[PDB]
Amino acid sequence: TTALVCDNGSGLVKAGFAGDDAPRAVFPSIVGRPRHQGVMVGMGQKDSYVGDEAQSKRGILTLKYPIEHGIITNWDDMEKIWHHTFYNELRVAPEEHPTLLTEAPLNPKANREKMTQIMFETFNVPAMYVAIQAVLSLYASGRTTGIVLDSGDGVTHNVPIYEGYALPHAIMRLDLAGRDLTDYLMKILTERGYSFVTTAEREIVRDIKEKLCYVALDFENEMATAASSSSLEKSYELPDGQVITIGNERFRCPETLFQPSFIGMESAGIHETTYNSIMKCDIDIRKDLYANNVMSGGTTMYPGIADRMQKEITALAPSTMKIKIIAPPERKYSVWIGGSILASLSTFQQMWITKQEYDEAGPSIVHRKCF
């Protein structure tokens, strides 16, 4: 029977079947619960809402993310999300479908242990596997060597792979992603008089960030241009009909990716993280890591980030080297595409973790069979 590929990110869930080109079900990973007083009896009122139903009714709901910084904090809500993506969205029975799941590098065991235990004793599958998202992003690119930067909603990580061999000592993880940018835009939108304090308007600020923000090639020149004339200002329409206008905040929000000290973090930018991941490898592969910078995730979808990354890496690298950033138009779903490519391979069918080996070894085989 067809295998299931489910990418469980911190903000979005992308589930579908192996062998397909696009994920069938893409929905936000939120659980909404009522916060006001119900006065009308009956009419099918539910105590919880999952996915697009929580987003459509978000004016009377408190929204919670079960995953924070790539780590599942609430397990009942995560089970609700998995039940919704198995029975309501994909409309399949999980007892007859192997499931491929994704996970961020440098994570604790207990996330993967409880993931395997929930997938084998609650939504009991014939087989399961946990894969690294950067290896799938390199699978979707069609190449073998390269350094992958995957930035999503909680985790931004750099993983270099040369000729199918990964270097785990150069894998870097940074807890700066799109939710931090949404919080920073929430903070700096009060600088013009716009107040967004609750969880429902966090989605509005996230929509503003998705539609109107961009990465500047030169930061100081863009701030000088924004201070000189009002040519970079853009208008947005609120759901209640109000119109807001933003200026430099279109490029100050993603600049925290390159300058984390805007939100008080001591770490370096993503360009310096990529460069330090390259020079922590062997020297004879660094050239092949310079021409194969693969970018994946929804956070890498700003329309100025590839040229800016090429500029900073060329400023850091020696001048005799070719820097080439790979930014495909479908890099928002490249982890799922790589998972669908990997699950359809004939050489992958011996690497599943079946139910018999789970019963024989306990929930600890997942660290000796996966990476």
Q: Which residues from 268-297 bind ligand ADP, rule CB under 6 A? A: 297
Q: CB under 5 to 8 A by kind: which of its own copies, Mg ion, ligand ADP, none does 12 bind?
A: ligand ADP
Asked if 265 and 306 count as a contact pair (C-beta separation under 8 A), the reply is no
Decide if residue 243 touches its own copies (CB under 8 A).
yes
Taking residues 116 to 155 in sequence order and writing x for each that binds its own copies by CB under 8 A, - otherwise, the string is ----------------x--x--xx----x-----------
Q: List Cα–Cα distances, 68 to 29, 152, 196, 342, in angstroms.
A: 11, 11, 21, 27
CA–CA dist 280, 288 (Å, integer)? 14
Q: Rule CB under 8 A: which of 83-112 touch its own copies?
A: 106-110
Residue 368 CB, nearest approach to its own copies (Å)? 12
Decide if residue 152 touches ligand ADP (CB under 6 A).
yes
Decide if residue 362 touches its own copies (CB under 8 A).
no
Q: Which long-range contacts (CB under 8 A, 24 or more apart) does 108-117 make?
A: 108/71, 109/367, 111/71, 111/72, 112/366, 112/367, 112/370, 113/363, 113/364, 113/366, 114/72, 114/75, 115/72, 116/353, 116/358, 116/363, 116/366, 117/363
Q: What angle do CA 362, 169, 178 make, to 5 degrees?
A: 85
243 bridge partner residues:
237
Q: Which stretch binds ligand ADP (CB under 6 A): 49-57, 162-170, 186-194, 298-306?
A: 298-306
Taking residues 1 to 30 in sequence order and writing x for each that binds ligand ADP by CB under 6 A, - otherwise, the string is --------xxxx------------------
Decide if residue 62 touches its own copies (CB under 8 A).
yes
Of 170, 123, 126, the residue nearest 148 (C-alpha): 170
Q: Rule CB under 5 A: which of 6-25 touch Mg ion?
A: 9
Residue 241 burial (CB count, 10 A): 6
Decide if residue 206 touches ligand ADP (CB under 6 A).
yes
How many whole angstroms from its chain centre is CA 152? 3
Q: Which of 71, 223, 268, 301 binds ligand ADP (CB under 6 A)?
A: 301
Q: By CB under 6 A, name the binding residues for ligand ADP.
A: 9-12, 152-153, 178-179, 206, 209-210, 297-299, 301-302, 332
